[PDB]
Every structure is written in structure tokens, then in C-alpha cells.
Task: inverse folding
């Protein structure tokens, strides 16, 4: 039975599923973001003060790995939660018509902002488009870091490399990747707040994008 | 596209705005009429909407005169304006000639008005279908009429959402010249045929007229005995 | 899209401009009417806007004649123009026949004007709903009317922002043939039902008429005893 | 593009809306007429749609007067309105001069009306072709007429979906001055020619008139003897 | 969007072109009127534009008759055309009944004209608001009127750019039944309230009328004593 | 672009819709007229379309009165409506003055009608050219007329698809004041000139009038002797 | 015979063919996806806890290869099934006209969302466009993984490489590829549900995108 | 003579030329595709069961080369046949006008779907655009395979390479290239059926995209 | 409670939050930018005068590092502050409708100019789009520099490199990176002023993008 299939779909991802997500975003998530932001800024301070020598190319700084993993963990929960909201809307996109699409436009509008969050802000795709990646740092931040650092480490170890700037770059890779996290957290917070507001103002039409007024005909 | 104005043919020779006007007709509740032995009848579904609406208020079978009745389906405001036009048009015929000899011509006058609004820009078609049933100097007559201004004379027909279920069902069961009491049963069966999955059929309206007589509206006590 | 012109059906058979006209009605303050024992009444909310506006100025219940009243909701300019049209239309019936026998026909004449503006290009619909209440040779009568030209006779009904809260509430509590004093209470309860979170209900208007009598407008001192 | 308005020539000097109007004509069932020895006839296909439709209801050959008939093809509402206009136009000529001397002029009056609706904005063309057949002071006459207002006099011609099959077939078999009984056979052969793959030809309509006489409509028993 | 044509409702039921017409009203200079003990007055700001303009030329309080005056704000050409209409409408009432009994009806006739231009395509609304003040058989009256055709009776009101500052100020200070000399002061205070940062208030216009009397226009010498 | 509406000049001062109307003229079959010794003649090609069309039906030379004839080319419906207008216009002149003194003025009246439809929106131009030939109190006259309303008097001219081939050929061979029998030959040569590659010229129409006489239409037996 | 050719086409891919696919998606497929999601998240937990040494570059983790192959297998069936639905619609796209395309639009609408599934969600093409690849991980996930790992393995074996970060990258390649599967499965689920709804609401017009009402002409 | 040149063109590529192609596609071609699909799936089964060692990097698997060459041979015939259809239409594109283009649109519409087949589905171009290549595998499939394998072979032979994952990649290259063929064949079949339907429903206007009705003028 | 959630959002990022940012930009920020511009131009002078030898490839010039880090620090504060403004607007984008969007357009207009600042002027993303990077130098300026220099340093040290032009390039990297900062600061200044004006002229509608006039209905 076809109506029963749809109904099972919608019963399983209700408006309280998506509201649940938004409550967490206004309380828990924004606070964990800000905490990551302070940890990353604090780790930046440490590194701005350090002078770097070959000593530093023999050890991956566990403070920075810490910050970076913590951030990847948040982006993971935010992506999974965004997708709950997206599911709740996508399964309520009604029959395709060339009319009565005032609600369907609200749906496509909000789904688009969730796309922006997931694809662009969280930078979650394999290859980002020709839109670039506008976010300072992706989900796969830890990997980008280790990779950028481990090339610099090879060159500095091996007769190492006698480039004085290459030594400073190792430091700059640590500094910049902590900055990139401060920045990315700020930007993520705006986007998370933007979505909270988009959702709360529009939820009624996200669930019921049409009303069936039959009062003119008999 | 070629569907934004009543005066514009598509390249295949279609007036899409007229076809859409016809979709308004499908949103009305089902109604049917059929000819029987020396008579004709109308039946129409009553989808009760609330305790708070008066029942003997807008029900759908309307006498045009004592010997002619009509059911409508589609936009209710437009149905009203067309029934009231039909009524006036019947009285004009009666004042000119002292009697409505052929009902086909009352229908034709109404259909003409409807067609006229599918040729001039600056007006929209009437979103209504009608069934006309009555007796005249030819015999019992059953007609229908659509937004386009199209006429057909039927032995049995339906209009409304459940049109197809009902026309399909009469296509198999209908017999000419039943007695009144059996035609009414056959009608009710047709109507029941059109609902989905063990859904209730509450009291419809039934009106009938037989040669030599005036129209009679069944009251809901008499109508119940067929449920 | 198909929602830019009153004369254009959507592909499903919808006149969107009419439906939007109907959204104008929702911005008005709530009003209700109900039938009771040998009578009918109207109640309408007064959202006081300022000390500086005269109170006995534009309030919403208007007598059409001595035995018929109306409440409106929607664009105020259009309400005015329709009430004045209704008033003239009543007097025309009285001059032609010496008495308004069926109020249904006054409403039908008003509704017809309203429908007419949903079929011709170059005019917009009236953004108003009305309730008509009064006594006539049939008895007490309660009607409503919308931008599309659609009529219904009710036992109780509402119009305005709080329509749904009120129709919902009467759907559960309304009883036929109460006494006047109780109908008025039940009405006030219905109206209070429609406000959100411990919000004040300031003095509404109430007008009533009972068979054999003329309309009477409650003055705000009498109205207070129900708050 | 230049096909959205009746008043707009394309750059090659084409009224596309007229041409599209003509496509409406092709959706009608086939009908033909031919001149024979001291007479003219019309034949028209009856695509039976249902047991439930009355047969002697809308069939397509219509007498304009006792000596003139017409078949139509295209939008049925528009056909109707044009046949009724043709009937009224014939009576006007009879009241002015006491007799319809040249049928060409009745057709010209109808064609003029049709052309008029291909020159003014705010109206759409009639989506109909007609054939006119009858006797007059010149002799037997066969004409056709299209949405554009274009007239031709023929010895034989067809209109409708199967026009080309039929005009192609008569182009090869048609002889002047056959007897009635053979012209009718030749016609039926032409019509059969137009169906695809061993498909049934149910009872068509046939009407004929011969000099000195009135029109006669073959009843379906007489028509069967040619199947 | 839905804001390009007066006949088009937005989906929320808004006539945007009307609302924009209302923005024209805000560009006018402020004016106010208020009821007092057995009387009513008007005050209007004069933004002097040049030494070279005659002062007793277009100032904004206009007598409609000896007992009724008006201030306008909005497009000046449209204000003129409405005042002149109001004047002619008052004289028609006087010729039909020999006296203007209720001023509400003069305002209603003007408002009706204004509303009429918000329902038909091919006209734009009047970009004006008016205040009407005067005495009649009910007492002193103060009304306003806007591009939409919307009427309200007030105890005090304002129109023009500084409307909100002034309605806000009277909402706090206004008292019923002051003497004339104090009402005028209170008015001048209200008006001063609406200017920004130690900006001059040059001589406004003031006109008043008290029961039993005719209108009087303060000359600028008398007006100065309140600055 | 500036070619969608008859009332719109392009920036170079062109009415493109008129020019496109002219392209309709080129789709008609060729026709020519020429002055000769005390006379004028018209010749027109007959592209035979079918055995089944009556030949003495719509051929293209039409008498306007006994001394004036016309050929047309372009939309056939519009040709008809203009010829019939020309005919009525001729009779009006005859009823006002008892005689058609200058044919230039009949043509002027027809051309004026044609021009009128190139200045007002909501009508399309007539897609026709005409040649007018006849005798009057000035002598033999030959004119042409186009969709724009443009008149020229010619010694010889052509209209239709093969216009250019024919006007080119007469530009080289035409001589004033030939005898009738030679003018007709010269004409036929001109017409043959316009066909491509050893293509047949079937029987054209020829009509001639010489001073002091009435028009005469060559019958196809007489016409053959020039092939 | 031409009508017979079309008829054989449509007889072999009926609406029950495509409905069949949708029932499986609502029951079987969504469950198998979620199971892959939990397997991948569990494997991520293991790896977050491991300290990595050269030991780990000598062996490809059979837990991760397992998860990845299982996911590739699902994507394979989902692509093949998507293509059944797509075939059912594509062979019922009617004669090309500039009118009566209200149904044709529903067809192009739904086919477009199946394109999005196959091309973008399942990332099934050779080279993805300048739209990027927004999906966290493609079909060819196993190959991407082995390839990314086997470069890091070469560098660590051969005097290996003494880069401390390069050792952590090996780990991060394992961690990230499991994350990428958790994320891709979540996102695939949304898309599969979206399609279930698209289809059930629109099927009527996907099969008969035009109705031949001839009732105005005679 | 100009009309004679056009006429020779059209005489030599008639509607029966293009109908001929379509009959073959509905019978022979779709069946040969499905057969390739089963050969490739069967080869995939074999490889899923094999454990791979250096032994396998010394021999190119003749089963896979077989499947791949067979598929390239089909794509070759389909391309050449598609181009017959395309020729039949392209030479009947009539005089350029701003009107009467109802038929011309049908032509442009069908030519476009043949472009999609050739360029995108068969992936027959040198460099694919910024539309990517959405098809799982091109015509030049054999070459892609040998090339991808031969780089892995070199690394594994030469002290070879001691990467455990590189050995598994050799296997995955064989597995994935067989999968890619199963997928590509499914997708190709849909497109071939889509074209069969496009053509049969539209052929009348593909040949005569305009009708010369001269019945209004005289 | 839903209204309470939105209200907490808007109470925490008011118009004074955003105005606060704009006052700083008009006073402090524009001055600190100009100071950086003069430091960078002065360091360019020094370098134009220096002749470079292998001596210079053994030391990273602490003057240039100084300028560059100072600039990165400004760009960091300007990004974080831009994001405050952007938050204030984003959380006041009202219910989605097809009407009354005159204010919403002012919002989208000004948000778009803040996007231009952050993404393009401050060049703050990981990968910039196919719009290019029009700014002379990004945030991550220090990193770009060290990296560009440290490749030239390796080639010049190691038999070094005997390329005479390679020696001049080392110098040109120092020169150009200082130029790039002069240019970027000039361009940033324009953009900061443009936003000051955009904001001060439009703030009223940025906060209340709709007015609820209910004066026509009763």
C-alpha cells in the first residue's frame, strides 16, 4: 500500500525530530563550538611564543592534534544532525505541480541553507566545486594538517634541509592551523544561528507546505 | 506556453484554459441522473461538513421550473449564477410561447452563455458542469453541460469527482425502462461504487418526475429506505 | 505561475487571486453569530487602538434594515461599500414587493455582486466576508458570504482572525434553542477561547433580534455583565 | 515568437493563431459531401462513444433550412453556435427577399463572421470547419468553410481527421453525375478508405437532396444496406 | 512580485499598490485636528519654501462649506481634485435636503470615490490623506480618510510626515473638553514635539469652529501669540 | 525587437508588422493588368489544385461594377472582405451622385480602410494587394493597392509571387496603345516569363474593357488561342 | 511495426518493476545502510584508541576493508536499482510538443533527482564535474583508500621515513575513511528517502504524463 | 544544381537508414549489452574470491581483457550507428527562420539526446568537459585499465614494493574495472531504450519538420 | 518555547553589537591598516636597495615576517568582526515569503558585501573559487611567503645553484611580498569603508526588514 509507505517514512522523522536538533544547536552545540574556539586561540598563543628548531620536527604537538580532533568531532555531529533536518523536509516535498508552490519554495529555500552548511561551511565533500572552499578549514582538518606538516618534516630530517624559512614554515603550519580553527568556528556559529532562525520562523510551512481549502467548490 | 489566456489556441488546436476550467468541475461531489419508465431522476451526494451547517441549505438539486431540475458541480458561486440564469431563461420561453416545448432549447440557451465566455478575452469560463432533467412534449429528457458549452443527451450520466466510477458502473448495469423504485436502487448502487474502502454513504438527495406529473423531492426518511 | 490574474484558472482548476482575496478576510478581528430560541445574535470583537478614536465610530455590526444586521471582516473600505450596497438592495426589494420575505435573497443579491468581480478582468474581488443575521417569514436566519461569492446558512459561525478557534469551540459546546441570556454567554466564551495566553477581552458589540421584534444593540454597560 | 496573438503577422506573413485554430478542426470525425446527378449529399462518421449516449442526440448533419444542410468538425460548442448563426442568417435572407436564391451568399455571411474573429484582438477564432450542401436557383451546391473564413465550392470534399485519405481517394475515383445510390456507395468507400487496419465502420449519417425536392435523412436501417 | 497592479492581491491578501499610495501621504507636512469643548480645530504646518511664493496662496486648510473644513497631505494635485469634489458633494447634499445633517456622510461619499480607484485596473489611487472637521446636527466631528478609502472618527488625529510624533504626544497629553485657547496650545505643543533638534516652528495655520457658529481662520498675528 | 505590434515604429521609422503583412501578398498566384488602345485588361494565373474543385468557383477577377474589375493576391478571406467592401463603396458613390466619375476615388476609399488598420492597436492589417482596372470619365484606369494603404496608377503592373519576373519583363517589352489582341499576347508572354524551367501555363483568366463598352470575361475556349 | 516495438519496451519495464525497487528501498536497503553506518562508526572507535607504529604500515586493516567493500556493494545495488526506475520513466517520455507538458515536467523533475542520486550521491562517474563531488566518499571507495594508504606505506617502509606526522597520517587515513563512510551513509539515506517520497507521490503521472480527453470535439 | 545536391544527400541517408539502426538496437544490441553485463559480473565473482600475490602482477588476466575488449567493440558499433541517426536528422534541418520551428525543436531535442549518448554515455571524446564524465567507464576502457594496472605492476616488480595495500590495489583495479563494466552496461541500456522511444514517437517530425499548407492564400 | 529561542538569539546579538564593530572600523581599524601599509612600504624600500648574495638565503628577514604577521593579525580581527555583523543580520532574516521582501533585499545586499570582504578581500578560504583570488595577498600570507622562499632557499643551498636569476628571485620574493601587502591594505581599506557606508545607510531595514501596518483591515 502506497499511502502506508509514505506514512511510515513521515512517522519516523517527525517535526519533533528536527526540533530536537534545533534545541541542541541553540544550547549545547554553540557552546561546544565556542569552547573549541578558545582552546584553539589558546594553542595559537603558545605557538606564537615558541622558537622552533629541528627538535620540533621530531614530535607532533599533541595540543594541536587535540584541538583539531575535537573540532572534527563537532562537525561530525553537526553534519549528522543537519541531515536529520534535511530528511524531515525532503520527505514532505509534495506532489510536483506548477502551482500552490508557495510552501514548496520555503522548503527549497531552507534545504538550500542546509546544503550550504554541510557542503560549504563544514566542507564535507571529497572535491569541492569551482565555488572554491570558502570555509577556512574542512572536516578533514586533521588529515590536511598532518599531511602539510609531514612533508615539511621529511625535508627537515631525511643531511636535513638548511633553509631557515622552511623551519619557520613548520611553525607557521602549526600557527595557521590553529587560526584556521578559530576562524572556522566563528563562521560555523553564524551559520548555525542562521539556520536556527530560518527553521523556527518557517517550520510550519516546512511540514505542511500546502493547505487543502475546498470551500469554493461543491 | 499557450495556457495563460482563454483566446489562445495551442499549436495542436487546444484551449487549455477551458480544459483547466473543467478540472474545477472534478472537485465537486458526485451527482447522477438517469431515465427510466416514463420518467427521469437525479441523485446527488451530500458530503456533510459539520453539525453547524443547515442541511436544507445549499443542497445541489434545484428546480428550474415545476417540470425541470438541475444538479451542478464545480465552483459553487458560478453554479448559483448559472442556475438563476437557467431559471430566468425558462420563464422567458414561457412568456414568449406559453410553454417550454423542448428542454433541449433551455439547455442550449444556457450552454450558449457558457461558450460565450470561452471566446472573448477579459472573461473567464464558468467552472461548472450541469445536469438537466425533466419532462417535455418530446418525453423525459436528461442532458449535461460543461464549462466549454458542450451538450449531450444521456440515458444516464454523472458529474463530479466520482464521475468515472459511476459512468463505468452504469455502463455495465444500466437497463432502459426500469420502474422508479428500481432505478433509484441502481442509482444508489452506482454512487456507492464510487467511494473508496468501506466508506459511509450518508443520505443523498433524490428527485424524480414521471410523465404527466410534477417533480417530487424525496425527503430524507424516504431516501433512507434505499441505504 | 497562474496567480497573477482573476480570470486565469490554474491547471488544477483554481482561481488563486480569489483565494488570496480570502486571506484579506483573516486580518479582520473576529466576529460571530448564532441562532437561539426564536432569535439570532451577533457578537464582534473591538480591538481598541487608541484613546483618541471615537468608540461609537466605526464599530462592525451594521443594521441593513430594522430586522436584518451584518458583521464584516476584511478590507474596511470594501466592507463599507458592500454594506451600503446591501442596504440599497434591501430597500429595492421592499419597494418592489412591500416586504423582505426571504433574507436568503438579499444575501444572494450581495453574493452575486461579489462573484461578478471574480469573473471579469480589470476588477479585483472584494476582500471581505460578511455575516447576515435577521428574522423573516421563514424564521431566524444566519448566513455568511465570502470574496468568492459563496453562501452558507449556519446555526452558528464566525469570521475573522479567530474564526477557527471559535468554529472549533462551538462545534463542541453549541446547543440549539438556548435562551438569549445563555446564547450570549456561550458566544462570549467562544470569543475568549480564541485569544492567546491570559490576554484581556475588552467590551465586544452584541446585537440581537427575537421573532416578532426589532433589532436591539446592547449598550456597553449591559455587555459588561457577561465579561 | 509570433504565434501568441491573432492580430500579429509573422515575418513571412502568417497568422499562426489561425493555423492553430485549423488544427482544432482535425480532431473532429470525418465527414464528406459530393455532388451527383441533379443532387448533392453529405456523409458523416459516427464514432460511438458509449451505450449510454442517445444516438439521435448530437449527430453532426444539421438542416439549415429545408433545402440546405451542413456538417461540422472541430470544437463542438463553436460548431453549434455557427450552425445556429447560419440558421438565423438563412431566415433573414428569406424575410428580406422571400427566398434563398444563392446559397453562396449564406455561406459568405457565415464565413464573414468567422473572418471577423481573425482580425480583432480580444477574440479567438472559431475552431470549426463546415460543409454546406443544398439546392438553389443555380443548382446543387457544395461548399466548405474554415476557421480563417475561407470559402471554396467543391464537387466533392471532406473535413475532419480523415480528410486527406478521403480527398485523396475521391481524387482518383470520383465521377460527375452518378446516380444517388452509386454516389452513396462511392462515398462509403471513400470513408472506409480513411480508417487504419481492418477497423470497423459503424453506421454513418447520410442526407441527400435532389433538384425539385426537399432534404431527406437516411434512417440507419436504409444506411446499413451500403455497409 | 505582486505590487505592480492595483487589482492584484498578494498571497497574504495585500494590495501593495494601495500601501505605496499611502507612502505618498507621508511626504506631506504635518497637520492635526482635535475636538474640544463645544468645538473642533485644525492646525497645519507651513514649511516656507521661499520669499518669492505668496503665503495666502496654497495653504492647506480648505473650507468645504461654512461649517466644514479639511486638511490634506500627499500629492498636492490629487488633494486639490479631492477637496473640489468634497465641495461639490456637500452642495449636492444641501440641494437634495436643504442641510448637511451628518458630516459622516460627506466623508463617506469622498472615501467611496477614493476606494473606487483601488478596485479597477487602469486607474491609480489618490495619493492623499484628509482630515475633515466641522459641526453638524450630531455635534462637533473629526474624521480622517486615506488613499484606501478608510474612515475613522477621532478625538484628535494627525496626518503627514510628523504623524507619529504627534499621535504619540496626544496619546499622553490630550484631554477632552478643554477650552479653545488651551486646545490650541496643546496642539502647538504636539506639533513642536514632531520636529528634530532645536528646529524653528514658523507660523502654522489654525482654524476653529464652535457649536452655533461659523468657521474662523486665525490670521498670523493671532497665531503668533501661541509660539 | 520592434516588430510585434502594428502601432510601434522601429528606430529607423519602420512599421514591421505592415511589411510582414506585405509578405502575405507574395504567397498569392501572379496577376497582371495593362492599359492598351482605348482599354485596359487583367490577366491572372489559375494554379489548378484538384479535379475536385469547381473551376468557375473562386477565380480571382471580380467585377466591382459593370465598368470596374479587381484582382487580388494574399489571404483569400481578406481579399473577399475587401472586394465586397469595394463593391458596396462603389454603389454608395452611385447613389450619392448617380455615377462613378473617377475610379481613383473608389480605390482611395478602399485604401483608406486598409490604412486605418495600420494605425490602431487591436487590429491586424489586411494581408492583400489589389489591382483595380476600369473605364471612367477620365479614360481607362489601372491602379494597385497594398496592405499599407498605398496607391499607384500604372500603365502595366503585377501582383503575386511572380510580380518581379513580370514587372521586369514588361519594363522591357511594354508599348503604349497596342491593340487588344496583342496586349493580351504580351501579357501571356509576361506571365510565362515568371514560371521556372519548362513548366506548364494552364488556362489563366482574362477580362477586358474598352472605352464606351462594358467588361467582358474571356471564356476558357477563347483564352486557349493565346497559349 | 513501430507501436509493437514501443509496447515491448514498456511491457518489459512496467510500473511494478519500479515499485518493486521502492519497496526494497523502504524495507531492506535503508536498514542495510544503517548497519554499514554502525559498522563504520565502530571501526572508527577502535582506530581512535590505537597508537600507530611501523607495525601498522605492514598490514592493511581487514576491519576497514570489510566496511568499505560492504558499502561499495550496497552502492552497486542502489545504482542498478535507480537505473530500473529511470528506465521505467525514460521510455514513457512522450512525443515532444510545446504543450501538455505538465506530466513531462514531473518526469524530468524525478529523473533529475535520480541523476543526483547516481551521479552525485553515489559518485559513480569517472571524473566528477566542476560541480565537485559533494558526497564524502564515492562508490570506488575501496580503491581511493588503498591508493591513499599505499603511498603513505611506501614512504614509511622503502631507511623508512622519520616524519612523526607521516605516521599519524597513516592512522588518520584509516580514521577518516571510516568517518567518510558514516557520513556518506547518512547522506545516502536522506537521498533514498527523498526518492521514495518523490516517487510515491508522483508515480501516476510518471507512467501516464498525458490524458487524452477528446470530449470537446466532434 | 543546388536542389540536386541536397536531394543526393537525403536519398543516401533515408528514414529507413535510421529505422534500420533502431530495429537492431531493440533486438541485437540490447542483448549483446546484457551478455557483456553477465560476463563482467561473472569475472567480478572470480576476482572477489582470489587472494593476490606477486604471481598476479606478472600476468594480465585474459578474462578481464576479454570482457573489456568486447564492450569496447559494442560501444564502437553503437557510436557509428548513433551517427547514422544523427546524419538522417542533421541533413533535414530546414531553412533557418524565426517561425514554424515546432518541428525543428523536435529535431534539436532528439539530436541532443544522441549527443548525450555519444559524448557522455559512451564517453567517446579525448578530454571530457567540465560536465565531468558521468559514465562509469569510457570507450577507451581497455587503455584506462592497462594503464592503471601497469603502474601498479611496475611498483610491485622493478626489490619490488613491500606495501600490503598496494598488492590489494592490483586486485581492486581488476575488481573495479569489472564492476565499472556492469554499471556502464546498465546505464547504456537505459540510454539505448530512451533513444528507441524518443525516435519511434518523434520520427514523423524528424523527417518532415514543417508542412507546407498554402490553403489560406490565393 | 519557540519565540523565546529566537528572542534569546536576537537579544545576544543586537544592533549595538554590530554598530560597535562599525565604530571600531571607522576609528581604530583603518588607522592600523594604514600603519601596516607604511611599514610594508618602508620594508620594500630597504629591499629595493639591497644587493643579495647566498648570505641572504641563510636567514629569514625579520622585518618582513614582522609586517606580514601584523597584517595577518588585522585580517583575523576583521574577519571575526565581519562575522558579528553578519550574525546580527542573518538572525533577523524573516519568514520566507514571495512578498514584502523590500527589506529582505537590503539584507541580502549587505550580507553579500560582507561575503565579498571575508571570502574575497581577506581571502580566507582553503581553496578560492573559479572567481580567482582578486586580492593581492590572503590571510595566510605568512605561510605563502615562507613556502615560496623556502623552495628558493633549498635550491640556492643543498653545490648550491649557480643561476644568477634564481638569486634575484629570492630578492624579488621579499620585494613582491611587501608590495603585495601595500596593495592589499589599500584594497582592504576601500572595502572596509564601503561596508561602513553600506551599514550606516541601511541599518534600519537590516534590523526591521518589515513593518506590520494592519491599518486597512478590521
Result:
Amino acid at each position: 500500500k502506497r499511502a502506508a509507505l509514505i506514512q511510515n517514512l513521515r512517522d519516523s522523522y517527525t517535526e519533533t525530530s528536527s526540533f530536537a536538533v534545533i534545541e541542541e544547536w541553540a544550547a549545547g552545540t554553540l557552546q561546544e563550538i565556542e569552547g573549541i574556539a578558545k582552546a584553539a586561540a589558546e594553542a595559537h598563543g603558545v605557538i606564537r611564543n615558541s622558537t622552533y628548531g629541528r627538535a620540533q620536527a621530531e614530535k607532533s604537538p599533541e595540543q594541536l592534534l587535540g584541538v583539531l580532533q575535537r573540532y572534527q568531532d563537532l562537525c561530525h555531529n553537526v553534519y549528522c544532525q543537519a541531515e536529520t533536518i534535511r530528511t524531515v523536509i525532503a520527505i514532505r516535498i509534495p506532489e510536483h505541480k506548477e502551482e500552490d508552490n508557495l510552501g514548496v519554495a520555503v522548503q527549497h529555500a531552507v534545504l538550500k541553507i542546509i546544503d550550504e552548511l554541510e557542503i560549504k561551511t563544514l566542507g564535507s565533500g571529497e572535491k569541492s566545486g569551482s565555488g572554491g572552499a570558502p570555509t577556512p578549514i574542512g572536516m578533514y582538518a586533521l588529515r590536511e594538517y598532518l599531511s602539510a606538516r609531514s612533508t615539511v618534516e621529511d625535508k627537515l630530517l631525511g643531511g636535513g634541509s638548511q633553509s631557515p624559512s622552511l623551519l619557520l614554515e613548520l611553525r607557521q603550519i602549526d600557527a595557521d592551523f590553529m587560526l584556521k580553527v578559530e576562524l572556522a568556528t566563528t563562521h560555523l556559529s553564524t551559520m548555525v544561528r542562521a539556520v536556527i532562525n530560518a527553521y523556527l520562523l518557517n517550520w510550519k510551512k516546512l511540514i505542511q507546505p500546502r493547505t487543502h481549502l475546498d470551500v469554493l467548490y461543491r | 506556453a499557450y495556457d495563460r489566456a482563454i483566446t489562445v489556441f495551442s499549436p495542436d488546436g487546444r484551449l487549455f484554459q477551458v480544459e483547466y476550467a473543467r478540472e474545477a468541475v472534478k472537485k465537486g461531489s458526485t451527482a447522477l441522473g438517469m431515465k427510466f419508465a416514463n420518467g427521469v431522476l437525479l441523485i446527488s451526494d451530500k458530503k456533510v461538513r459539520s453539525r453547524l451547517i443547515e442541511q436544507n441549505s445549499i443542497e445541489k438539486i434545484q428546480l428550474i421550473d415545476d417540470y425541470v431540475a438541475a444538479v451542478t458541480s464545480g465552483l459553487v458561486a458560478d453554479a448559483r449564477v448559472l442556475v438563476d440564469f437557467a431559471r430566468i431563461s425558462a420563464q422567458q420561453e414561457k412568456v414568449t410561447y406559453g410553454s417550454l416545448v423542448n428542454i433541449e432549447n433551455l439547455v442550449k440557451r444556457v450552454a450558449d452563455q457558457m461558450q460565450q465566455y470561452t471566446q472573448y478575452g477579459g472573461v473567464r469560463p464558468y467552472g461548472v458542469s450541469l445536469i438537466f432533467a425533466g419532462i417535455d412534449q418530446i418525453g423525459p429528457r436528461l442532458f449535461d453541460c460543461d464549462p466549454a458549452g458542450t451538450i449531450n443527451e444521456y440515458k444516464a450520466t454523472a458529474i463530479g469527482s466520482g464521475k468515472d466510477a459511476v459512468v463505468s458502473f452504469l455502463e455495465r448495469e444500466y437497463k432502459e425502462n426500469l420502474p422508479e423504485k428500481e432505478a433509484v436502487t441502481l442509482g444508489i448502487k452506482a454512487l456507492k461504487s464510487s467511494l473508496e474502502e468501506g466508506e459511509e454513504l450518508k443520505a443523498p438527495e433524490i428527485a424524480s418526475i414521471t410523465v404527466g406529473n410534477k417533480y417530487r423531492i424525496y425527503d430524507q426518511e424516504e431516501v433512507k429506505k434505499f441505504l
